[PDB]
């Protein structure tokens, strides 16, 4: 709702940042293996920015990755439905 979809995103972004590191360590070559950049990666992912500096290589990494897209893209296609209503209405008044 007002800021409710916002929160659920941030669960997913953290949660996902965390499991990303858990899944990706042990895979020889993974780029995505410290909690900080895992967190930036999951924003990169939920917003579908696509800079492409980080991504997963393991299977469970990609699995986490899909949850973030689904859960974040639905978050964001609802957090951005809402910065669009409140702020456009404020500037409409």
């Amino acid at each position, epitope marked *: 709702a007002a800021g409710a979809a916002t929160v659920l995103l941030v669960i997913v972004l953290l949660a996902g940042s*965390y499991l990303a*590191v*858990l899944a*990706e*360590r*042990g*895979a*020889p*070559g*993974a*780029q995505l*293996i*410290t*909690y*900080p950049r895992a967190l930036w990666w999951s924003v990169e992912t939920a917003t579908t920015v696509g800079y492409g500096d980080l991504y997963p290589v393991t299977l469970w990494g990609r699995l986490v990755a899909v949850v973030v897209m689904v859960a974040g893209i639905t978050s964001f296609g609802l957090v951005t439905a809402a910065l669009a209503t409140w702020f456009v209405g404020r500037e409409q008044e």
Partner: antibody
Amino acid sequence: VQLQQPGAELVKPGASVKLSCKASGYTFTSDWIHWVKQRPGHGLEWIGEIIPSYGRANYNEKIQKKATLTADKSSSTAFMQLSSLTSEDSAVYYCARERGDGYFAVWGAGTTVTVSS
Amino acid sequence: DILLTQSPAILSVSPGERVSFSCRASQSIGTDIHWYQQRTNGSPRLLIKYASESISGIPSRFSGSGSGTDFTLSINSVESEDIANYYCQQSNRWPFTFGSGTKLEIKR
């Protein structure tokens, strides 16, 4: 002393040995514990890391995988099971505490292992 | 397994003078290099983290430069308490890896 591990172990060849590391200070969710091996007159060889709160561990690909890592969530001590040892396995064994951000902030004083009959 | 290459293997230097250790990596690793000092009989001791950032409790002598594949630790003046082995360590791809190390020696 943030990471605190025994001084020396003596092992007969072929035997196993379990190495400890009690870790006062903070006991974070996200903390990893690593194990670096320093043969005499050599540099540091990473060996394996473990996240104790969550269980899972990861070992060095390219060395003969002798060891297996374990943890005790409520005792803040973590273990490393070196198994069937030779003399090539005698070295100092450090544990380090990596916050999750990829450097070893903290290092145990290290456990000198000697494999001889 | 990213290959960190510290040359030279040993480093002479007359005291009070700047000194630099190079750690070159087998591929670009951004800035995810971190330096450790390890004296005789002691465990290693994080000196510099993420190439440039400094650790609290470390002399201001120590300074860290570099990015990509070429990295450098530096001591703007040396004293005899710095004789030790110095390692680099990359955290940019799994597994984390260590440099071969450089020993500091002092012409006196």
